[PDB]
Design a protein around this ligand. Structure first.
Ligand code: PEB
Ligand code: PEB
Ligand code: CYC
Ligand code: CYC
Ligand code: CYC
Ligand code: PEB
Ligand code: PEB
Ligand code: PEB
Ligand code: PEB
Ligand code: PEB
Ligand code: PEB
Ligand code: CYC
Ligand code: PEB
Ligand code: PEB
Lengths: 162, 172, 116, 177, 139, 177, 177, 162, 162
């Protein structure tokens, strides 16, 4: 788990160093943006069921074959649509964990590592999840620097699927 | 590693004699079935990603408590490491199909596999029920009459079954 | 070559179970079949020694006689006999040991900014 | 301890199903072949004094360095113990075949006899030469092709059963290995 | 020297048989095979191979070649309820071969027992076989 | 596949080919009394080695000048050729029993057979005497009326296939008449 | 049940057969002195391998010209073929001992063997010397008067069966003279 | 012990691979030199008894000093000849063991591995030992391709001492 | 490339040994199965334009969105349909390269290694190419062991994508 605090510890531990004024501004700058990032995590938490089901329908409008084609990898059934809504809820949960810790720690560990082994095995396309995340990027309805923190960790997830 | 020819070398060295003439006519029976061995390993490894993903899919259907959050196979790191070990047994069983004995399967893959799983905490009764899906998806794959002419291949499926039940009793 | 086909997913799991060390993990990477067909079939024995001293020992070659002095180890007892006599040198043990992934030692001069 | 009848229950437990007709078809054929296995193990335990005779007097003619003064079967307690150490391990596999499961062999003896034996100092290659001398001693008796004593059975072919006691005794030897 | 007779061919054979029988189609006949065991996998097959023979087969043909009835008897003392006789005639091979003739000692060689061949040793009766009689340290 | 039976023969080439279980009943529906006819070949080819040896030695022990120095069953290359010569006419009459016609026997074996024997000096009165013992054996084996070896069969009559092989042996004797 | 024995020896192939406890009582009752005769065949075939190894080397020990270059015990396939001819006659004389006749000995083994040996260049008077050791070696095993070995037996004489093999070994020597 | 089957397996395992059609062909050629190597080591046991001391007399009639020298390392007295029905029978044993497996398996680890240490510190010079099996390579009777496959592993054992 | 010849050479300079008869049988079994291999590579090359345009149409019949979606990754242009047809030209050419040398060497060098990183960077779905290869696998018209060799390198291309 990389945080700003568990990264400046690690460069202090590389040099045998007591925590100098170099490593006391890397952890101070997390505190001047933990205000704006924890309101964005609180806002995305409350509007989760609007954003999950709205993005699951915006996938199905762009890619209509996924609701039509038979076989278990598609959203053409009841349980096929339930597992797609589970997956965007897994994706949106790791965005809010990154706004708590201030970096891409929890989606590196719990989401990204080992993801391409799944998407090739179970025949799931990585462009089904760009369209789900590009909905959430410009339909969360945030503004200012609260939107700047949520839009940083959303397109980190787009770049590890692209 | 040892195959069937390497058995009776080391089964007569240790005592240090030869092998004798009454054993090798059983071993020249084995080369009559040498062409019915290599089709059958070609039947398994051509479908080597359709026996894995069709049986992990039928594993999480009956056991939803592994893909639920807080489960063993929950995250994408531990889903990829569940499909890794489901294919690892498919290699070392088919290695024991081509060789004639078990002694590369239970020396490189089953020697401490359940005690790997007791230390990690994976359900060792539940890896046996994924393997027994892969037993039934491969024995019933290796009885097709397309691609080969018809003949009886029964003993190899018992030999092919007999290493799939050897991984079914290794992991519990 | 950190592609999907060039990864070693069974050697990766034995590091995570603490079965093998880092020194046994570097030895599995030079004896890996992606390292043969991409970095050993396309140069001779006197350039491959320049690879396995720059990357493994982390230093440059001393002079050109050391490439001559090392290249008969690969042609007599093989690449698997070449790595364990290179991982048992004192230059590998006295600053990497049994637990450190190697690196290029002293690439830059501390007052400067250019280096090697 | 596991039973083969117990083996389908924990198979049907994490699966959370009932018992169907599908996996039941293995066990109902196990009933009618139960008497054939019951015609096997009675002759394993009733010629057991011969099988522990040829366990230890046979392995000592192919390495006599243990009866030498300084060896690992020299004194008459270690002479007594090697007669005793082999007559328990065939008593355990007589339990193990009636359940059918090797886990009763594993938890009782085969979990940790190897870690004792290098602190008890005995060699393991001498042990597996004494394990395997009971292996072919066993499989003559189940088939009735033994030379000097031929016993009463019925007529058939228990070579599926005769591989199973050979499927035990290698794991007896691999545990010490 | 074990087979110094590898080609020897004193058949006369003037070429007056070639207009009625070709060289490739010479002593070749369809041999019929049968996997008849009252089973589902019972196959009939034919194959067309070269036909050879030897001069011995007026009285000892190729099915009856070196097939002599062997007897195995299991008998414990007073154990006639488990004693048995068996009878088969396999293709019976003889014992292993006669040795060198040897000079006056050496170490002749042998072999015996069921599982394996494990051969003997021999200084004409006495069977030395690696005891290291030359045991002379120099203190 | 009767043509693929013939395509073992007519391409002059040494292969091996078979007929499976589903492919048997296509031939068994086509060939009348195929359960009799496959028994009729298997009664012959299980004793095909013994059929040539009683045939050639009855030719020797009735015509004793053939094994004379100067006779045509001297000089053991020439003896082994005569034993080879009785084998090829046995396999061709066995394949004529399978195919149901002698038309592969006439051209491959009997064509040119007459003057190729006086090309080498074969006494053809002994050769007609040699093949007549094989005519007496094949009516004993197919009808299971051999005086020393009876074999197990399904119960019934086989007198048509006894007469067909005895017709097919007479085409061999008329080819060297 | 000697018809079950004779059908084993007539089928001219490799086929295993064995006798249970009921039919062994039919064997012991049909053949007179069956307690004596089945001992007498067991005393030979327990040491049949040393009998063929001694006697043809005793044939070497009196006729040393067979291991000369140009002799008939040179070219070690041909030396093993003399050993293969050693072992067939011991199995054939033991079945001739067991059946109580030589009618199975004459047709399957003794018919035409003199003509076989003079056509193969086999020195037949040397084999007379090799088979006369077998007449001495079988008598000392039936009477249990062997100098180096002594097997346990029931009390009594076996001099009818000791004289019966001398009738059987002289039939071999008359056949090859 | 390196069977030609077992290096199709071991060079499908260090790359982490299923048994493809490349290594399926190498075990087919092991099934093609099967019957032509199995008549070799069967019938070499059938003529084994002549070949032990018939080759020993092809050393003492080459080397008269080996019966005449005063030393423990020769067949001079009656105790050295009993080692000489053992130490060249091991050469006759492993050439039968190589024709079972169809490769140079058992003599690569039992015989040749660590051999100069045995040779120099016993003074058992292989000028006897090359001629010990040089009688075997021409007087052992395997003709045809049975001869050339039985002579294939004999002169591998020649060149390892030469 | 890994042929059965070049892996028999590769185990020799693994140990640094000479070429024994544990590698001549590997080349011997290659020469047996090369007569049912070059009769397969001849027939796939002769019917190559029938197989390629039939396999492009099997993708377009199963996935009709690819013929009409706008964007660069789909075959709805003129140049989109040309890049699709040369891709199935590339997948057939590496099958007949692998049948000639007798192993999976050319498609390991040219197809397989690095395939995931270009199907993710260019948004190419790997279920398109399995449908293009499943049309070839049961409509080449081959029959027998000549069919059994083409159905092991088409099936090796499928299991990379699957
Ligand atoms: C002279 C030394 C000599 C003969 C005269 C001639 C004897 C002979 N035998 C037959 C008949 C058959 N031979 C058969 C062959 C065999 N019988 C078997 O049981 C085995 C399997 C096989 C080989 C020995 C068969 C089946 C017969 C028919 C049954 C029968 O005996 O009648 C004949 C032809 C019939 C006749 O007498 O006209 C002859 C002439 N062989 C000699 O060596
Ligand atoms: C020359 C080198 C040479 C001979 C000449 C010949 C000596 C010889 N030995 C016998 C008699 C027997 N051989 C027997 C065989 C064996 N005895 C055993 O105990 C084992 C089982 C087996 C193999 C060694 C037996 C049982 C006898 C009869 C009793 C006896 O020992 O005498 C003869 C025949 C008797 C005679 O006419 O002299 C001969 C010629 N062997 C040589 O090696
Ligand atoms: C009919 C197939 C579907 C399809 C194809 C399509 N592919 C591309 C682009 C590329 N494909 C490759 C793949 C390879 N190149 C190789 O050299 C090899 C090995 C021999 C392979 C497998 C690459 C590298 C590209 C990009 C470069 C290029 O060729 O242009 C495209 C263009 C996409 C783009 O963004 O440029 C298409 C349209 N698409 C379909 O709709 C068909 C279903
Ligand atoms: C269906 C999946 C089941 C499951 C799998 C699971 N396994 C692990 C972890 C390991 N498994 C092994 C065993 C092997 N690794 C090998 O490389 C080989 C062959 C050489 C074997 C036999 C080891 C060593 C580990 C730990 C290292 C690792 O692979 O990660 C895990 C945990 C993964 C983690 O990172 O913790 C899972 C989830 N477990 C289940 O619940 C399924 C039933
Ligand atoms: C043909 C006779 C020649 C001969 C024989 C001889 N050998 C020895 C002793 C040894 N030879 C070995 C070598 C091996 N032993 C093995 O088991 C193997 C297989 C792995 C090999 C390669 C060893 C270790 C010994 C010593 C132990 C032993 O006695 O076997 C001797 C005795 C020498 C001594 O001083 O003890 C002889 C006479 N030597 C010759 O000179 C003959 C030509
Ligand atoms: C009690 C005697 C049993 C019995 C046991 C069986 N033993 C079998 C083979 C065998 N027996 C021994 C022991 C003996 N022979 C020796 O050479 C030595 C000295 C080294 C001794 C003490 C050995 C070594 C063996 C071979 C086993 C091996 O080493 O692999 C055996 C199988 C043969 C058979 O009978 O078919 C059996 C059944 N025999 C009995 O019937 C009584 C009841
Ligand atoms: C003979 C075939 C063996 C061998 C036998 C010896 N065993 C010795 C001691 C010993 N063994 C055990 C384990 C024993 N208890 C069990 O319940 C079972 C079966 C499951 C077994 C095998 C124990 C606990 C001990 C120690 C007993 C004690 O300390 O009281 C032994 C030595 C006796 C001694 O040291 O006094 C021998 C000789 N060892 C051999 O060398 C061959 C291979
Ligand atoms: C044996 C009971 C006869 C007898 C037989 C001999 N035949 C000899 C040579 C020979 N036979 C054939 C015909 C045979 N071979 C075939 O390939 C076919 C069918 C395709 C048949 C029927 C041929 C062709 C030849 C040799 C001439 C050639 O190869 O072109 C033969 C050898 C004579 C000699 O070499 O001096 C014998 C003894 N002769 C008899 O006396 C009885 C009656
Ligand atoms: C050894 C003590 C003799 C001796 C024996 C040789 N026999 C050779 C070949 C041979 N032996 C038999 C006899 C045996 N086998 C049987 O199948 C039957 C009957 C069922 C018997 C009695 C036969 C049939 C043969 C083959 C002859 C043929 O093909 O016609 C033989 C080698 C010759 C060869 O391989 O060509 C030898 C050396 N010869 C001796 O010098 C002593 C006295
Ligand atoms: C005349 C040569 C025989 C005889 C022949 C009969 N066989 C009859 C039935 C039958 N035959 C076979 C064996 C045959 N069929 C095969 O498919 C194969 C090889 C794969 C062979 C050798 C079988 C299996 C059967 C069926 C037996 C049953 O299930 O009851 C038969 C009855 C009429 C018929 O079905 O054709 C006859 C007359 N029987 C004789 O008495 C002489 C000796
Ligand atoms: C002759 C070569 C022997 C000899 C033979 C005698 N055996 C006598 C009784 C007897 N024989 C056997 C073994 C035999 N009968 C069988 O049923 C079987 C195989 C299933 C064999 C091998 C037994 C078991 C017995 C009974 C022993 C007893 O009464 O306790 C016997 C007495 C007369 C008779 O019963 O025929 C004789 C003379 N005895 C000899 O001294 C020579 C060496
Ligand atoms: C939804 C947008 C599209 C879709 C979804 C779909 N997904 C699956 C199956 C799985 N998805 C995963 C993914 C993850 N698991 C994780 O733990 C994480 C990190 C938190 C991720 C990203 C896994 C492991 C599976 C398989 C197990 C499961 O059942 O969930 C399916 C089912 C596939 C099947 O074969 O059953 C579906 C249908 N597919 C669509 O059609 C939508 C466009
Ligand atoms: C490199 C890879 C490779 C293989 C996999 C085998 C494939 C193979 N099998 C057969 C030939 C055959 N193969 C089978 C096999 C089977 N029939 C069944 O019902 C079972 C499903 C299956 C066993 C697993 C049968 C029954 C025959 C015909 C009988 C025979 O082999 O003689 C043949 C024709 C030559 C022959 O008959 O032997 C070939 C080439 N050979 C190879 O070179
Ligand atoms: C009181 C104690 C007691 C026993 C000893 C067993 C006795 C026993 N054995 C078998 C019966 C049998 N046992 C065997 C076993 C064998 N036959 C062989 O050829 C091999 C040598 C051997 C092991 C492979 C066979 C083949 C049958 C017949 C099949 C059967 O009905 O079980 C049967 C069933 C048929 C019958 O009633 O006889 C019974 C009750 N059960 C008991 O309750």
């Amino acid at each position: 788990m990389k945080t700003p605090i568990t990264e400046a510890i690690a460069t202090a531990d590389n040099q045998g160093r007591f925590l100098s004024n170099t490593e006391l501004q890397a952890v101070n700058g997390r505190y001047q943006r933990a205000t704006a990032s924890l309101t964005a995590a609180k806002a995305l938490t409350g509007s989760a069921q609007r954003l999950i089901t709205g993005a699951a329908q915006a996938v199905y409008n762009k890619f209509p074959y996924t609701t039509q084609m038979p076989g278990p990898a598609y959203a053409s059934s009841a349980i096929g649509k339930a597992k797609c809504a589970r997956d965007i809820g897994y994706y949106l949960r790791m965005v809010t964990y990154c706004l708590v810790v201030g970096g891409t720690g929890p989606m590196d560990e719990y989401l990204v590592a080992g993801l391409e082994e799944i998407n090739r095995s179970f025949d799931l396309s990585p462009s089904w999840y760009i369209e789900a995340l590009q909905y959430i990027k410009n339909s969360h309805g945030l503004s200012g620097q609260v939107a700047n923190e949520a839009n940083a960790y959303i397109d980190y997830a787009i770049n590890t699927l692209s | 590693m040892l195959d069937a020819f390497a058995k009776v070398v080391a089964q007569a060295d240790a005592r240090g004699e030869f092998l004798s003439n009454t054993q090798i006519d059983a071993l020249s029976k084995m080369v009559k079935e040498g062409n019915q061995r290599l089709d059958i390993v070609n039947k398994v490894t051509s479908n080597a990603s359709a026996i894995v993903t069709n049986s992990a899919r039928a594993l999480f259907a009956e056991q939803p408590q592994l893909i639920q959050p807080g489960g063993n196979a929950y995250t994408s790191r531990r889903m990829a490491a569940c499909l890794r070990d489901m294919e690892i047994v498919l290699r070392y069983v088919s290695y024991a199909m081509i060789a004639g004995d078990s002694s590369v399967l239970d020396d490189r893959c089953l020697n401490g596999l359940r005690e790997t799983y007791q230390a990690l905490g994976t359900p060792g009764s539940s890896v046996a029920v994924a393997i027994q899906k892969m037993k039934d998806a491969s024995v019933a794959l290796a009885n097709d009459t397309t691609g080969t002419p018809i003949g009886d291949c029964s003993s190899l499926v018992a030999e092919l079954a007999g290493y799939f039940d050897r991984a079914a009793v290794s992991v519990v | 070559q950190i592609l999907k086909s060039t990864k070693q997913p069974f050697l990766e799991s034995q590091l995570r179970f603490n079965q093998i060390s880092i020194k046994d993990f570097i030895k599995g990477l030079v004896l890996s079949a992606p390292f043969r067909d991409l970095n050993y079939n396309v140069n001779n024995n006197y350039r491959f020694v320049e690879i396995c001293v720059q990357r493994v020992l982390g230093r440059d070659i001393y002079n050109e006689r050391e490439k001559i002095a090392w290249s008969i180890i690969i042609a007599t007892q093989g690449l698997e006999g070449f790595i364990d006599t290179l991982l048992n040198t004192q230059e590998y043990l006295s600053n990497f040991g049994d637990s450190i992934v190697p690196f290029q030692r002293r690439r830059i001069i501390p007052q400067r900014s250019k280096g090697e | 301890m596991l039973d083969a009848f117990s083996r389908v229950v924990v198979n049907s437990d994490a699966k959370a199903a009932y018992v169907g007709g599908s996996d039941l078809q293995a066990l109902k054929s196990f009933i009618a072949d139960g008497n054939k296995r019951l015609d096997a193990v009675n002759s394993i335990v009733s010629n057991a004094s011969c099988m522990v005779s040829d366990a230890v007097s046979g392995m000592i003619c192919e390495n006599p360095g243990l009866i030498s003064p300084g060896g690992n079967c020299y004194t008459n307690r270690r002479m007594a113990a090697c007669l005793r150490d082999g007559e328990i391990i065939l008593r355990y596999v007589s339990y193990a075949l009636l359940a059918g499961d090797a886990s009763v062999l594993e938890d009782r003896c085969l979990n940790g006899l190897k870690e004792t034996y290098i602190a008890l100092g005995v060699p393991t290659n001498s042990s597996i030469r004494a394990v395997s001398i009971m292996k072919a001693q066993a499989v003559a008796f189940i088939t009735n092709t033994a030379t000097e004593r031929k016993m009463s059975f019925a007529a058939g072919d228990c070579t599926s059963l005769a591989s199973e006691v050979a499927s035990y005794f290698d794991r007896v030897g691999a545990a010490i290995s | 020297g074990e087979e110094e007779e590898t080609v020897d061919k004193e058949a006369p054979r003037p070429e007056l048989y070639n207009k009625y029988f070709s060289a490739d189609r010479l002593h070749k006949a369809p041999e019929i095979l049968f996997e008849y065991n009252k089973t589902k996998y019972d196959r009939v097959g034919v194959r067309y191979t070269e036909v050879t023979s030897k001069a011995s087969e007026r009285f000892f043909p190729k099915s009856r070649m070196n097939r002599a009835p062997v007897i195995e008897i299991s008998y414990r003392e007073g154990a006639v309820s488990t004693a048995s006789v068996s009878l088969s005639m396999p293709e019976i091979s003889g014992p292993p071969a006669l040795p060198f003739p040897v000079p006056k000692g050496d170490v002749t060689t042998t072999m015996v027992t069921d599982p394996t061949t494990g051969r003997l040793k021999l200084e004409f009766k006495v069977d030395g076989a690696a005891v290291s009689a030359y045991s002379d340290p120099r203190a």
